[PDB]
C-alpha cells in the first residue's frame, strides 16, 4: 500500500479530503492553523496513488504527500 | 421582431479584438504563464465552454461556417487566377498528351528559378498535380479569360460569404428553433442544394460542356470553337453535334425521352479519344441524380400536414434485442452539435475515400487518366482527407459522450445498451485485430523468412501456397459480364479495372483490367487489419470516455485530460483524447499502407505504355505480383527502388521535392522528442534557463512553462503526421513526375 | 473643437503647444506616440545636415579640391570615386561630434530622461548671433523652415543626379 | 413614411430631411447598416473624382500635351500613361491625399464635427452663408451624380465602339 | 481606431509584420546583390 | 597555400564547373524560341552564373580539389571577409536585438501590468527602445560597470 503523510503546513482547507476518490483522507481537529483542522490519512490501505489529493493542495510545496510503495489489488485499482 | 432571427444581437466593435482570450472565463483575466498563450488557441473554437446557451453556440457555428466557405471561395479564386495568369492552360489545350500542366511560376531569387521546370508549351513553372486543367477542359473552359472571370466571381463570392457571416452573427442571428428544424434543413439540403446543383450542372454540361468538348475531341482548335453563350442563343451550333436539339423541349414534356438519347447516353467505359468518362454519360448521371435528390427532398414534414417526422420514425424502430431502440436519438442529434459533427465527419471521410477510389477507377475528366501524377496525387490526397475526417468523427463522438450525453434521456436506448456491453464489443474487436494482424503480417513475415532461408516453394505466393481472392475475382467477372446481361442497356463495363480491353490514349495506358492475385489478398487483409485496429482505438475511446473499471468517474475529468495519476499502476492516456491521438497514429499507418499499395500496384500492373502491336510495358514491370509479398520486397523493390528519383533530384527542377523529403524526415524525427519525452524534464531545464535570464535581468514577466502533457502529445502527433505525410508526398510526387 | 490651422479640416494635434514652429501640422499624430522633444531634435539635426549637404553639392560641382580623387562634379559619383577611406573618416568624425555634443546620452530613451535640455540647443553660438531674444524666435523659425526646405532640396538634388547622372548646374 | 423619390416605398428611416440632396432614395436600405456620414463621404468623393475624370477624358480626346506619349486616345491612354510613369505620380499624390482622408474620416466618425466631404477647401468664397452653401452643395451633388453616370456611359460606349469624342 | 490600433499592437500581428518586413529586406538585399558568399568589402 | 588549397582564379576544376553549368544552361536555352520570356530567364541565369563565378574567382577565395570556395576561418585577417567581418556584423545585429529585448522587458517590468504589455506590445515604447540599440556595445559596458546588468542573490535556487 502507498504511504500518505500530512505536514504541519496544512491550512485545513479540506480540498484534499473532498478530492480523494477512495476515502483515504479525513479532516481531524487541530490547533496549528486558523481553521483548527488538519488532514489525516487513516485509510491508506485504500490509497490508489492517483495523487488527486495533492493536486488540490494550495500550500506552497504541498501539505499532503503520497509516496508510492508496495502494490495491492486495492492500490492497483483492479476490479478483477 | 422576426420569429426566426434576433436583430442586432452583437455590436460590431474592435474593442474585443484588443482583449485576447475574452471568450473564455479563465483566459479573460490575462496571461500569467506561457500556458495561457497555448490555451488561447486551444479554446478558440470550443464554443461549448464559451457560452452556456445552445443558441449562441449555434450562431457562432453558423458564422464560422460562413467564414470557412469564404476561405474556400478565396482558395478557388486563387486557383482560377493562377490558371488564368501564371499557367500554360492554352498551350495544354492544344496538346494535352504532350504538355505537362503547370500553373505556378517561381520568382528568380536565391537560385530558386531552377524550380521552373520544362513543362512544355513554351512555359516554365511547377508541374501541377491537382488536375485543374482536366477539370477546366471538362467544364468547356477554352480560354484564360474565362478562368479570370471565374476567379473574379470567386472573389465576389468569398466577400459575399464573409458578409453573410458578419450579418448572421451581428445583424440578424437565427434562433435555436430555426437551427433545430432538421426536417426542413434535410429537405432543403437534399432537394435544393444537392438536387438543384446536380440539375444546374447537368444543364451546364448539356449546353456548354457537351458541345465544346465534342468539338475539342473532333480536333477543332479552341480559337475557332464558338463562345459558350452562342451554344444557347443558336440552337444550330449544338444541333449539329447532337441532332436531337432540333426537337426542342417537346420530347421532354411529351414523355418522349427516347429522343434525347443523342446526348443522354448510357455507355460505360471511357472515351477513346480522351480516356475519360463519356460526358454524355456524365450529363445523364447528373440529371438522374438531380431527379432522385429532388424526390428525396420531399420526405420530412416541415410546415404542412405532409411528410415524415424523424422522431416518429426513430421511435418506431425498436426490437427484442435492442430494448427501446432509437428512442431519444432525435433529441441527441437536435441538441448536440458534437454528435452531428461525429456522424457527418465519419461519413464525409468515408465519402472522400470512396471518391478517391472511383476517381482513378473511372477517370471522369478528359486526359486525366494519362496524367499519372494527377491521378496519384488525387487518390492520395482524398484518402488522406478521408482518414483525417474519420478520426475527427470518432473524436467528436467521444466529445459528445463526455459532454453532451445525458444518461437520464437515454434510458435503455441504443446508446445505453452499447455502453452496457462495451466490454464484449472491445474484447471481440481486440481478438479480431489480433487475428487479422497475426495472419496478414505473419504471412508477410513467413514469406520473408522462407525467402531468406532459400525455400521459395514454402512462400504464400502464386507459384507456391496460393491464396487466391476468389470472392473479388467473382465480382470482377460479374461486372465485366454486366453489359447486356444484368445491365442490358449498357454498352461497356463501368470500369475497365473489372476487365475488358486496355484503354490507351497517345500510347499511354488510361485504364486496364487490374488482376487480383495472392499479392492483393495479403495487402487487402493488411488494409482490413489496420482499419480494424484504428476502429478499436477510436471505439475504445468513445465507449470508455465516461467511465471504466480504472476510473469510475472519467466523465468528471473531461474529454481532454492527461491522466488521473501514477496510481493504479499508472493511468496515462486514459482520456478519450488520448485515444484520438493513438488513433491518429494508426490512421496514418493504415492510409500510408493504402497509398503505398495503390502506387505500387498501379505503377506495376496498370500504368505504362502500349506498343503499336499491342504489347503492354509497365512503369516497373510487374514486380508487384512476386515482390510485394515480403517486407524485404516492399523495402527494396518499392521504397529503395522508387526513392531513386527523389534522392537524385538535386540540381534538377525536382530538387524542391528532395528538399521537402529531407525536411519532412527532419520534422518526423523532431516529433519523437515530444512523443518520447515528458514535461518534468523540460520544466526543470526551463528552470535553469530562467535562472540564467534572471541572472541577466531578462526573465520575462510571462513565466515560461513547458508545454502541457496534452499539448506535448498534440505537438508530437502533429509533427509526426506532418513529417510522414510530407515524406510520402515528396516521394510520390518526385517519383511519378520523373517517370 | 479647435481644428488645426494648417490642415483646417483636422482637429488640432496635441503636444505641439510650446514650440517655435507650431502651425498645427501633425495629421498622423507622430507627436502622440513619439516624444516631441526627440522629434524636434531629430527635425533640427536632419535639417542642419540637409542644409550642409545642399551647400556641399553646390560647392562640389563648382569648386572641388585639387587631386585625382576629388574631380567629380556629380555628388553621387563623387561618393564612389572618393573611396571608402575619406568617407569613413567623415563617419568617425561625425560620431565623435555626436558623442561629445550630447555628452554621452545619445539614444531616444537616454536623451531628455533628465530634462533640462532644450531640443536642438547645443549652445553653439561663437559669432554671437542670438544675444537679443527678440530676434531669437525669428531665427529659430527661419532655421526650421530652411532645414525643411533643405531636406526637400537634398532629396531633389540626389535624385536628379541619379536619373540624369551629369550634375545639378 | 412614403419617401419622396419612390412614393410607394417607405422612408429609409435614416434620411429624414437634414442632408443636402436627400430625396429619400434608399430602396435597398444601405443606410440601415452603414453610417450615413461614411456613405455621404463616399458619394461626394465619387462625385468629384468622376467629374474630374469626365472632363479629363473629353478634353484629352481633343487637346494633347506636347510629346509622342500623349498622342493616344483616352481609351488607350491608361496603358501608355502607366508605362511612362505618368499615372504613378497621380497615384503617389492621391495616396497622400487619401491617407490624410483616412485621418479625416476617422475623426469625423469619432466626433469632431467635420461635415462629410468638407475639407474646408475654399480659396474663393462662392458660399458666404448657410443658404448659399446648401445650394452649392446640392449643385455639387447633382453635377457629380450626372458626371458619374456620364463617365460610365462614355467609357462603356468608347470600349464598345472605338470612336472619338462622339461615342455614339 | 483606438482598439484596432491596440489589436495591431498584439504579439501575433506585430510578429507577423516584423518577420514579413525582415524577410522582405533580406530577400531584396539578396536580389540586388545576389550570390554573396563573403563580405563585400 | 593555406591548408594545401589554391586560389580559385587558378583552379582548373573551378573553370570546368563554370563551363559545365553554362553548357547545361545553354542546352536548356536551345529548346525555347526567340526572345520569349523563358529564353530571357535562362539568359539571365547564364549571366548571373558567369558573374558569380567571376566574383568568386576575384575574391581571395581558396578552392580545394573539388573546385569549390573553402572558407579560411582560423582568424587571419587576409581571409577576414569570409568569417571575421560577417562575425562582427552578426554580433552587432544580435546584440542590438538582445539589448532592445532586455530593455523592453526591464522597462515594462516596472508597470502595473507587466504581463499585459508582453502580449500587447507598447508600440511607442517599443519603437523608442528599438532605435536605441545602436549603442548596445556602449550601453552594455556602461550598465555592467554600474552593477545594473547582473543580479546577485535575489535569483531563485532549487532545494539542493
Ligand atoms: C488563396 C490562395 C492563394 C495562394 C496560395 C497564392 C499564392 C501565390 N500567389 Mg496569389 N492570388 C490569389 C490567391 C492565392 N495566391 C488570388 C485570389 C489572387 C487574385 C487577387 C491572386 C493574385 C496573384 C498575383 C497577381 C500574383 C500572385 C502571386 C502568388 C505567389 C507569390 C505570393 C507572394 O509572394 O506574395 C507575397 C505577399 C505578401 C508579402 C503580402 C503579405 C504565390 C505562389 C504572384 C506570383 O506568382 O508571381 C509570379 C503574383 O504576381 N497571386
Ligand atoms: C434550397 C435552399 C438551401 C440551400 C441551397 C442551402 C445551402 C447550404 N446550406 Mg442551408 N439551410 C436551408 C436551405 C438551404 N441551404 C434552410 C431552409 C435552413 C434552415 C433549416 C438551412 C440551414 C443551414 C445551416 C444551419 C447551415 C447551412 C449550410 C449550408 C451550406 C452547406 C455547405 C456546402 O455544402 O457548401 C456548398 C456551398 C455552395 C454551393 C456555395 C453557394 C451557396 C450559396 C451561398 C447559396 C445559399 C442559398 C441560400 C440559402 C439563399 C439565401 C439568400 C439570402 C439572401 C436569403 C450550403 C451553402 C451550412 C453552412 O455552410 O453554413 C454557411 C450550415 O451550417 N444551412
Ligand atoms: C469539420 C471539421 C472539424 C471541426 C469543426 C472541429 C471542431 C472542433 N474540434 Mg476537432 N477534429 C477534426 C475536425 C474538426 N474539428 C479532425 C479531422 C480531427 C482529427 C485530427 C479532430 C480532432 C480533435 C481533437 C483531438 C480535439 C478537437 C477539438 C475541437 C473543438 C475545438 C477546436 C479548437 O479550438 O481548435 C482550434 C484550432 C487549432 C488549435 C489549430 C491547431 C493547428 C493544427 C493542429 C495544425 C495544422 C497544420 C496545418 C495542416 C499546416 C501545416 C503545414 C506546415 C508546413 C506549417 C472544436 C469543436 C478539441 C476539443 O476540446 O473539442 C471540444 C480536441 O481536444 N478536435
Ligand atoms: C512494428 C511495430 C509495431 C507492431 C508490430 C505493432 C503491433 C500491434 N499493435 Mg501497435 N503501435 C505501434 C507499432 C507497432 N504495433 C506504434 C508505433 C504505436 C504508437 C501509436 C502503436 C499503437 C498501438 C495501439 C494504440 C494499439 C496497437 C495494437 C497493436 C496490436 C494489433 C493486434 C495484432 O496484430 O497483434 C498480432 C501481433 C503482431 C501482428 C505482431 C507480430 C506477430 C507475429 C507476426 C506473429 C507471432 C510471432 C510468434 C508469436 C513469435 C514466437 C517466437 C518468439 C517467442 C521467439 C499488435 C500487437 C492494438 C492492440 O492492443 O491489439 C489489438 C491497439 O489497440 N498498437
Ligand atoms: C480623374 C482625373 C484624371 C486622371 C486620372 C487623368 C489621367 C490622364 N490624363 Mg488627364 N485631365 C483631367 C483629369 C484626369 N486625367 C482633367 C480634369 C483635365 C482637364 C484639364 C485633363 C486634361 C488632360 C490633357 C489635356 C491630357 C491628359 C492626359 C492624361 C494621361 C497622361 C497625362 C496625365 O496624367 O494628365 C496630365 C494632366 C493635365 C495636364 C491636366 C490635369 C489637370 C488636373 C486634373 C486639374 C487639377 C486637379 C488637382 C491637381 C487635384 C489635386 C490632386 C490632389 C491629390 C493633390 C492620363 C491617362 C494626356 C494624355 O495622354 O491624353 C491621352 C493629355 O494630353 N489629361
Ligand atoms: C518589407 C520589406 C521590403 C523592402 C525594404 C523593399 C524594398 C524595395 N522594394 Mg520591395 N517588395 C516587398 C518588400 C520590401 N521591398 C514585398 C513583400 C513585395 C511583394 C512580393 C515587394 C515587391 C516589390 C516590387 C514589385 C518592386 C519592389 C521594389 C523595391 C525597391 C524600391 C522601392 C526597394 C529596394 C522595386 C524595385 O526596386 O524594382 C525595380 C519594384 O519594382 N518591391
Ligand atoms: C545558420 C547558418 C547560415 C549561415 C551562416 C548562412 C549564410 C549565408 N547564406 Mg544561407 N541558409 C541557411 C543558413 C545559413 N546561411 C539555411 C538554413 C538555409 C535554408 C533556408 C539557407 C539558404 C540559403 C540560400 C538559398 C542562399 C543562402 C545564402 C547565404 C549567403 C548570403 C547571405 C546574405 O544574404 O547576406 C546578405 C544579407 C545580409 C548581410 C543581411 C544583413 C544586412 C543588414 C540589413 C545590415 C544593416 C546593418 C548595417 C551567406 C554566406 C545566399 C548565397 O549567396 O549563398 C552564398 C543564397 O542564395 N542561404
Ligand atoms: C449482424 C447482426 C444484426 O444486426 O442483427 C440485428 C439484431 C436485431 O436487433 P433488434 O431486432 O432489436 O433491432 C431492432 C431495432 O433496434 C432496429 O435497429 O441486432 C442485434 O441483436 C445486435 C447484436 C450484434 C451482434 C454482432 C454479431
Ligand atoms: C517638392 C516637394 C515638397 C515641397 C514643399 C515645399 C518646398 C514647402 C515646404 C514648406 O512650406 C512647408 C510645407 C512648411 C514650412 O514650415 C516649411 C517649408 C519648407 C517652408 C515634394 C516633392 C516630391 C517629389 C516627388 C515625390 C517625386 C517623385 C518622382 C518620381 C516618383 C519619379 C519617378 C520616375 O523617374 C523614375 C523613378 C523613372 C522614370 O522613367 C519614370 C518616373 C515615374 C518619371
Ligand atoms: C520624397 C521626399 C519628400 C516628399 C515630400 C512631400 C511629398 C511633401 C508634401 C507636402 O509638402 C507638400 C507638397 C505640401 C505641404 O503643405 C504638405 C506636405 C504633404 C507636407 C523627400 C525625399 C528625400 C530623399 C532623400 C533626402 C534621399 C537622400 C539620399 C541620399 C543622401 C543617398 C545617398 C546614396 O545614394 C548615394 C548618393 C549613393 C548610394 O549608392 C549610397 C547612398 C548613401 C544610399
Ligand atoms: C521540447 C519539449 C517542450 C518544451 C517546448 C517548448 C517550450 C515549445 C517552445 C515553442 C517556441 C517558444 C515557439 C515556437 C517557435 C518555432 C520556431 C515556431 C514554429 C515554426 C513555424 C514554422 C510554425 C515541452 O514542453 C514538452 C512537453 C511535453 C512533452 C515533450 C515536450 C518537449 O519535447
Ligand atoms: S504524468 Fe505522465 S505519467 Fe505521471 S501520471 Fe500524468 S501521465 Fe501518467
**CB contact E10 to B (< 8 Å):** yes
What is the rounded distance in angstroms from the CA atom of residue C117 to the CA atom of residue C111? 8
**CB contact A76 to B (< 8 Å):** yes
Residue bearing the CA closest to ligand 2, atom 64:
B62
Of all residues in chain B, the one with the smallest CA distance to F25 is B114
What is the rounded distance in angstroms from the CA atom of residue C43 to the CA atom of residue C34? 13
Q: What is the CA radius of gyration of chain C?
A: 19
CB B670 within 8 A of CB B723: yes
**CB contact C34 to F (< 8 Å):** yes
Is B682 annotated as ligand-binding? yes
Integer CA distances (angstroms), C131 to C134, C138, C139, in order:
9, 13, 11
CB B725 within 8 A of CB B387: no
Q: Do B567 and A80 touch (CB under 8 A)?
A: no
Check pocket membership of B572 for ligand 4, CB cut-off 6 A: no
What is the rounded distance in angstroms from the CA atom of residue B213 to the CA atom of residue B202? 14
CB B521 within 8 A of CB B447: no
Q: Record the cell numbers describing residue B333, joined without a space.
A: 442529434
SS3 per residue for B354-415: HHHHHHHHCCCCCCCCCCHHHHHHHHHHHHHHHHHHHHHHHHHHHHHHHHCCCCHHHCCCHH
Quick one: CA dihedral B606, B610, B614, B618, positive or negative?
Answer: negative
What is the rounded distance in angstroms from the CA atom of residue B122 to the CA atom of residue F42? 13
- Residue B523: closest CA among B389, B677, B634: B634
Instruction: Map grid coordinates 417537346 to a residue.
Output: B250
Name the minimum distance, in Å, from the CA of E27 to any CA of chain F.
Answer: 16
What is the rounded distance in angstroms from the CA atom of residue D71 to the CA atom of residue B180? 67
Contacts 24+ apart (CB under 8 A), F40-49: F41/B108, F41/B113, F41/B116, F41/B124, F44/B108, F45/B108, F45/B113, F46/F22, F48/E34, F48/E35, F49/F18, F49/F21, F49/F22, F49/F25
Integer CA distances (angstroms), B429 to A21, B296, B535, B549, D35, in order:
31, 36, 9, 19, 63
Query: How many Cα neighbours within 13 Å face the side chain of C47?
Result: 17
What is the rounded distance in angstroms from the CA atom of residue D127 to the CA atom of residue D121? 11
Alpha helices in B139-196 (DSSP H): 144-166, 176-179, 182-188
- Residue B166: closest CA among B33, B235, B63: B63
- Residue F148: closest CA among F101, F100, F102, F114: F102
Q: Record the cell numbers describing residue B397, joined without a space.
A: 463522438
CB B205 within 8 A of CB B279: yes
* Residues 6 or more apart whose Cβ sits within 8 Å of residue B599: B376, B380, B638, B642, B732, B735, B736
Q: Do D104 and C8 touch (CB under 8 A)?
A: no
The DSSP secondary structure of B59-90, one letter per residue, reads HHHHHHHHHHHHHHHHHHHHHHHHHHHS--HH
What is the rounded distance in angstroms from the CA atom of residue A77 to the CA atom of residue A43? 15
What is the rounded distance in angstroms from the CA atom of residue A38 to the CA atom of residue A48? 21
* Residues 6 or more apart whose Cβ sits within 8 Å of residue B525: B436, B439, B440
Instruction: Map grid coordinates 486557383 to a residue.
Output: B79
Q: Do B549 and A48 touch (CB under 8 A)?
A: no
Give the residue numbers of the binding site of A: 10, 13, 16, 20, 47, 50, 53, 57
- Structure-determination approach: cryo-EM
CB B475 within 8 A of CB B489: no
**Which of B13, B14, B110 is facing E30, going by the closest CB pair?**
B110
The DSSP secondary structure of B262-329, one letter per residue, reads GTS----S--TTTSS--HHHHHHHHHHHHHHHHHHTS-B-SSSS-SB-HHHHHHT--BTTTBTTTTTH
* Residues 6 or more apart whose Cβ sits within 8 Å of residue B585: B717, B720
- The alpha carbon of D87 is separated from its chain's Cα centroid by a whole number of angstroms, namely 19
Q: Which protein residues are within 6 Å of ligand 11, measured from CB?
A: B 673-674, 677-679, 682, 706-707, 709, 712
Residue bearing the CA closest to ligand 12, atom 8:
B572
Check pocket membership of E28 for ligand 6, CB cut-off 6 A: yes
**3-state helix, strand and coil shares in percent for chain D, rounded to the nearest 5:** 55, 0, 45
CB A58 within 8 A of CB A48: no
Q: Record the cell numbers describing residue A65, joined without a space.
A: 504527500
Q: Do B569 and A52 touch (CB under 8 A)?
A: no
**CB contact F127 to C (< 8 Å):** yes
**CB contact B14 to E (< 8 Å):** yes
SS3 per residue for B476-528: HHHHHCCECCCECCCCCCCCHHHCCCCEEECCEEEECCCCCCHHHHHHHHHHH
What is the rounded distance in angstroms from the CA atom of residue B641 to the CA atom of residue B620? 9
Quick one: CA dihedral C126, C131, C135, C136, positive or negative?
Answer: positive
* Residues 6 or more apart whose Cβ sits within 8 Å of residue B654: B117, B645, B646, B734, B737, B738
What is the rounded distance in angstroms from the CA atom of residue B319 to the CA atom of residue B275? 51
Contacts 24+ apart (CB under 8 A), D130-137: D134/D20, D137/D20, D137/D21
- Residue B370: closest CA among B210, B202, B137: B137
What is the rounded distance in angstroms from the CA atom of residue A55 to the CA atom of residue A60? 12
CB B573 within 8 A of CB B582: yes
- Residue B260: closest CA among B239, B231, B236: B239
**What letter would DSSP give residue A28?**
E
Q: Do C35 and F132 touch (CB under 8 A)?
A: no
Resolution (A): 3.0
Q: Strand B172-174 relative to strand B616-618: parallel, antiparallel, unpaired? A: unpaired
A69 φ, ψ to 5°? -140, -135
User: Chain E interface, mutation test: which of F123, F124, F127, most E Cβ atoms within 10 Å?
Assistant: F123
* Residues 6 or more apart whose Cβ sits within 8 Å of residue E17: none
Amino acid at each position: 500500500s502507498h504511504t500518505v503523510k500530512i505536514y504541519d503546513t496544512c491550512i485545513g482547507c479540506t480540498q484534499c479530503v473532498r478530492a480523494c476518490p477512495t476515502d483515504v483522507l479525513e479532516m481531524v481537529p487541530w490547533d496549528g492553523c486558523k481553521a483548527g483542522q488538519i488532514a489525516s490519512a487513516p485509510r491508506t490501505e485504500d490509497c490508489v496513488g492517483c495523487k488527486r489529493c495533492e493536486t488540490a493542495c494550495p500550500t506552497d510545496f504541498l501539505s499532503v504527500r503520497v509516496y508510492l510503495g508496495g502494490e495491492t489489488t486495492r492500490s492497483l485499482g483492479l476490479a478483477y | 421582431k422576426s420569429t426566426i432571427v434576433d436583430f442586432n444581437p452583437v455590436e460590431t466593435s474592435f474593442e474585443k479584438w484588443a482583449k485576447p482570450g475574452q471568450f473564455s472565463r479563465t483566459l479573460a483575466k490575462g496571461p500569467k504563464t506561457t500556458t495561457w498563450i497555448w490555451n488561447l488557441h486551444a479554446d478558440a473554437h470550443d464554443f461549448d465552454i464559451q457560452t452556456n446557451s445552445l443558441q449562441e453556440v449555434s450562431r457562432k457555428i453558423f458564422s464560422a461556417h460562413f467564414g470557412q466557405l469564404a476561405v474556400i471561395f478565396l482558395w478557388l479564386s486563387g486557383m482560377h487566377f493562377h490558371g488564368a495568369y501564371f499557367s500554360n492552360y492554352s498551350a495544354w489545350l492544344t496538346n494535352p498528351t504532350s504538355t505537362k500542366p503547370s500553373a505556378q511560376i517561381v520568382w528568380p531569387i536565391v537560385g530558386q528559378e531552377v524550380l521552373n521546370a520544362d513543362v512544355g508549351g513554351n512555359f516554365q513553372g511547377i508541374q501541377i498535380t491537382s488536375g485543374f486543367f482536366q477539370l477546366w477542359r471538362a467544364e468547356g473552359i477554352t480560354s484564360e479569360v474565362e478562368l479570370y472571370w471565374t476567379a473574379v466571381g470567386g472573389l465576389v463570392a468569398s466577400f459575399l460569404m464573409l458578409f453573410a457571416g458578419w450579418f448572421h452573427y451581428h445583424k440578424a442571428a437565427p434562433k435555436l428553433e430555426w437551427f433545430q428544424n432538421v426536417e426542413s434543413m434535410l429537405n432543403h439540403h437534399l432537394a435544393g442544394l444537392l438536387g438543384l446543383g446536380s440539375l444546374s450542372w447537368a444543364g451546364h454540361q448539356i449546353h456548354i460542356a457537351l458541345p465544346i468538348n465534342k468539338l475539342l475531341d473532333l480536333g477543332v482548335s479552341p480559337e475557332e470553337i464558338p463562345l459558350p453563350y452562342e451554344f444557347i442563343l443558336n440552337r444550330d451550333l449544338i444541333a449539329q453535334l447532337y441532332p436531337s436539339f432540333n426537337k426542342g423541349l417537346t420530347p421532354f414534356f411529351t414523355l418522349n425521352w427516347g429522343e434525347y438519347s443523342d446526348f443522354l447516353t448510357f455507355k460505360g467505359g471511357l472515351n477513346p479519344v480522351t480516356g475519360g468518362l463519356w460526358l454524355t454519360d456524365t450529363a445523364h448521371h447528373h440529371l438522374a441524380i438531380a431527379v432522385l435528390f429532388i424526390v428525396a427532398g420531399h420526405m420530412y414534414k416541415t410546415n404542412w400536414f405532409l411528410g415524415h417526422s424523424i422522431k416518429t420514425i426513430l421511435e418506431a424502430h425498436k426490437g427484442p434485442f435492442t430494448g427501446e431502440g432509437h428512442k431519444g436519438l432525435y433529441e441527441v442529434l437536435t441538441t448536440s452539435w458534437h454528435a452531428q459533427l461525429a456522424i457527418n465527419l465519419a461519413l464525409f471521410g468515408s465519402l472522400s475515400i470512396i471518391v478517391a477510389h472511383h476517381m482513378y477507377a473511372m477517370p471522369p475528366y478528359p486526359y486525366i487518366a494519362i496524367d499519372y501524377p494527377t491521378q496519384l496525387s488525387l487518390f492520395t490526397h482524398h484518402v488522406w482527407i478521408g482518414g483525417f475526417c474519420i478520426v475527427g468523427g470518432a473524436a467528436h463522438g467521444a466529445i459528445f459522450f463526455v459532454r453532451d450525453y445525458n444518461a437520464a434521456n437515454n434510458y435503455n436506448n441504443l446508446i445505453d445498451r452499447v455502453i452496457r456491453h462495451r466490454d464484449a464489443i472491445i474484447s471481440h474487436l481486440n481478438w479480431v485485430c489480433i487475428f487479422l494482424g497475426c495472419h496478414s503480417f505473419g504471412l508477410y513475415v513467413h514469406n520473408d523468412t522462407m525467402r531468406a532461408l532459400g525455400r521459395s516453394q514454402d512462400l504464400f505466393s502464386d507459384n507456391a501456397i496460393a491464396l487466391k481472392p476468389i470472392f473479388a475475382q467473382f465480382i470482377q467477372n460479374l461486372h465485366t459480364l454486366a453489359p447486356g446481361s444484368t445491365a442490358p442497356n449498357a454498352l461497356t463495363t463501368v470500369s475497365y479495372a473489372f476487365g475488358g480491353d486496355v484503354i490507351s490514349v497517345g500510347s499511354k495506358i488510361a485504364m486496364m483490367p487490374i488482376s487480383l492475385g495472392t499479392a492483393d489478398f495479403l495487402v487487402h487483409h493488411i488494409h482490413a487489419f489496420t482499419i480494424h485496429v484504428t476502429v478499436l482505438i477510436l471505439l475504445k475511446g468513445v465507449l470508455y470516455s465516461r467511465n471504466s473499471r480504472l476510473i469510475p468517474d472519467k466523465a468528471n475529468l473531461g474529454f481532454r485530460f492527461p491522466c488521473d495519476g501514477p496510481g493504479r499502476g499508472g493511468t496515462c492516456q486514459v482520456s478519450a483524447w488520448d485515444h484520438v491521438f493513438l488513433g491518429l497514429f494508426w490512421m496514418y499507418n493504415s492510409i500510408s499502407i493504402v497509398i503505398f499499395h495503390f502506387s505500387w500496384k498501379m505503377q506495376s500492373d496498370v500504368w505504362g505504355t502500349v506498343s503499336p502491336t499491342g504489347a503492354v510495358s509497365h512503369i516497373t514491370g510487374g514486380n508487384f505480383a512476386q515482390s510485394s509479398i515480403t517486407i524485404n520486397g516492399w523495402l527494396r523493390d518499392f521504397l529503395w527502388s522508387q526513392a531513386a528519383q527523389v534522392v537524385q533530384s538535386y540540381g534538377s527542377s525536382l530538387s524542391a521535392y528532395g528538399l521537402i523529403f529531407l525536411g519532412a524526415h527532419f520534422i518526423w524525427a523532431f516529433s519523437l522528442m515530444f512523443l518520447f519525452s515528458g514535461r518534468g524534464y523540460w520544466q526543470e531545464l526551463i528552470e535553469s534557463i530562467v535562472w540564467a535570464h534572471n541572472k541577466l535581468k531578462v526573465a520575462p514577466s510571462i513565466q515560461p512553462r513547458a508545454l502541457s502533457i496534452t499539448q506535448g502529445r498534440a505537438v508530437g502527433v502533429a509533427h509526426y503526421l506532418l513529417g510522414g505525410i510530407g515524406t510520402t508526398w515528396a516521394f510520390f510526387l518526385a517519383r511519378i513526375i520523373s517517370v | 473643437k479647435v481644428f488645426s490651422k494648417s490642415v483646417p479640416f483636422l482637429l488640432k494635434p496635441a503636444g505641439l503647444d510650446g514650440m517655435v514652429g507650431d502651425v498645427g501640422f501633425d495629421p498622423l499624430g507622430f507627436a502622440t506616440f513619439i516624444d516631441i522633444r526627440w522629434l524636434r531634435e531629430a527635425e533640427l539635426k536632419n535639417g542642419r545636415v540637409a542644409m550642409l549637404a545642399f551647400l556641399g553639392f553646390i560647392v562640389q560641382e563648382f569648386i572641388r579640391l585639387p587631386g585625382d580623387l576629388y574631380s567629380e562634379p556629380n555628388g553621387v559619383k563623387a561618393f564612389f570615386q572618393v573611396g571608402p577611406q575619406p568617407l569613413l573618416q567623415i563617419f568617425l568624425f561625425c560620431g565623435f561630434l555626436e558623442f561629445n555634443m550630447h555628452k554621452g546620452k545619445l539614444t531616444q530613451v537616454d536623451m531628455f530622461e533628465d530634462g533640462k535640455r532644450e531640443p536642438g540647443n547645443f549652445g553653439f553660438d561663437p559669432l554671437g548671433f542670438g544675444k537679443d531674444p527678440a530676434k531669437r524666435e525669428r531665427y529659430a523659425l527661419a532655421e526650421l523652415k530652411n532645414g525643411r526646405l533643405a531636406m526637400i532640396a537634398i532629396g531633389g538634388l540626389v535624385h536628379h543626379a541619379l536619373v540624369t547622372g551629369h550634375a545639378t548646374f | 413614411e412614403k419617401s419622396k423619390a419612390v412614393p410607394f416605398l417607405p422612408r429609409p428611416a435614416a434620411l429624414d430631411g437634414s442632408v443636402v440632396g436627400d430625396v429619400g432614395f434608399d430602396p435597398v436600405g444601405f443606410t440601415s447598416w452603414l453610417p450615413l456620414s461614411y456613405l455621404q463621404e463616399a458619394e461626394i468623393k465619387h462625385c468629384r473624382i468622376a467629374m474630374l475624370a469626365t472632363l479629363g477624358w473629353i478634353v484629352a480626346d481633343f487637346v494633347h500635351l506636347p510629346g509622342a506619349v500623349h498622342e493616344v486616345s483616352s481609351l488607350a491612354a491608361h496603358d501608355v500613361a502607366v508605362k511612362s510613369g505618368a499615372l504613378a505620380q497621380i497615384l503617389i499624390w492621391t495616396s497622400i491625399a487619401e491617407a490624410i482622408s483616412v485621418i479625416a474620416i476617422s475623426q469625423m466618425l469619432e466626433g469632431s464635427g467635420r461635415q462629410p466631404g468638407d475639407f474646408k477647401f475654399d480659396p474663393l468664397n462662392f458660399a458666404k452663408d448657410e443658404k448659399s452653401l446648401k445650394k452649392m452643395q446640392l449643385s455639387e451633388l447633382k453635377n457629380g451624380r450626372l458626371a458619374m453616370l456620364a463617365f460610365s456611359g462614355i467609357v462603356t460606349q468608347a470600349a464598345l465602339t472605338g470612336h472619338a469624342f462622339p461615342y455614339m | 481606431m483606438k482598439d484596432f490600433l491596440k489589436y495591431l499592437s498584439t504579439a501575433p500581428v506585430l510578429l507577423t509584420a516584423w518577420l514579413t518586413f525582415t524577410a522582405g529586406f533580406v530577400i531584396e538585399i539578396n536580389r540586388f546583390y545576389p550570390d554573396a558568399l563573403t563580405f563585400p568589402f | 597555400d593555406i591548408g594545401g588549397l589554391n586560389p580559385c582564379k587558378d583552379s582548373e576544376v573551378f573553370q570546368k564547373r563554370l563551363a559545365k553549368t553554362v553548357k547545361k544552361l545553354e542546352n536548356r536555352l536551345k529548346k525555347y524560341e526567340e526572345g520569349t520570356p523563358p529564353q530571357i530567364a535562362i539568359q539571365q541565369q547564364i549571366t548571373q552564373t558567369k558573374q558569380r563565378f567571376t566574383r568568386y574567382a576575384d575574391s581571395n577565395l581558396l578552392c580545394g580539389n573539388d573546385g569549390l570556395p573553402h572558407l579560411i576561418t582560423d582568424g587571419r585577417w587576409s581571409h577576414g571577409s569570409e568569417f571575421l567581418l560577417p562575425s562582427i556584423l552578426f554580433l552587432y545585429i544580435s546584440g542590438w536585438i538582445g539589448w532592445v529585448g532586455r530593455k523592453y522587458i526591464r522597462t515594462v517590468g516596472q508597470t502595473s501590468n507587466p504581463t499585459e504589455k508582453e502580449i500587447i506590445i507598447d508600440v511607442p515604447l517599443a519603437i523608442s527602445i528599438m532605435t536605441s540599440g545602436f549603442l548596445w556595445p556602449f550601453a552594455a559596458w556602461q550598465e555592467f560597470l554600474s552593477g545594473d546588468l547582473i543580479a546577485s542573490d535575489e535569483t531563485i535556487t532549487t532545494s539542493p
